[PDB]
């Protein structure tokens, strides 16, 4: 229920691919950003901030957090690994 944080964090998680670079996979930038969006939408308020926080702790390796989220989402069975195929 952190309505103010949700809006910021939701996009912030996705901005990580910008801020931490597309990791050399800039050709699939669109795919990458979409997957991160599916990540943020399948997560909740607390997860958004939790992962985001880690991203600010390591801006250079935001992917580590995105991969963590991705695997966690696949783990719970929210999203198939195929949808997050870049990180997972």
Curated annotation (Swiss-Prot):
<protein>
    <recommendedName>
        <fullName>Zuotin</fullName>
    </recommendedName>
</protein>
<comment type="function">
    <text>Component of the ribosome-associated complex (RAC), a heterodimeric chaperone complex involved in regulation of accurate translation termination and in folding or maintaining nascent polypeptides in a folding-competent state. RAC stimulates the ATPase activity of the ribosome-associated pool of Hsp70-type chaperones SSB1/SSB2 that bind to the nascent polypeptide chain. ZUO1 can act as a J-protein for SSB1/SSB2 only when associated with SSZ1.</text>
</comment>
<comment type="subunit">
    <text>RAC is a heterodimer of the Hsp70/DnaK-type chaperone SSZ1 and the Hsp40/DnaJ-type chaperone ZUO1. RAC associates with ribosomes via ZUO1.</text>
</comment>
């Amino acid at each position: 229920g952190s309505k103010a944080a949700k809006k910021k964090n939701k996009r912030a998680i996705r901005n990580s691919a910008k801020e931490a670079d597309y990791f050399g996979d800039a050709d699939k930038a669109t795919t990458i950003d979409e997957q991160v969006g599916l990540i943020v939408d399948s997560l909740n308020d607390e997860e958004l901030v939790s992962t985001a926080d880690k991203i600010k702790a390591n801006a250079a390796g935001a992917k580590e957090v995105l991969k963590e989220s991705a695997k966690t989402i696949v783990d719970s069975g929210k999203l198939p690994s195929s949808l997050l195929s870049y990180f997972v």
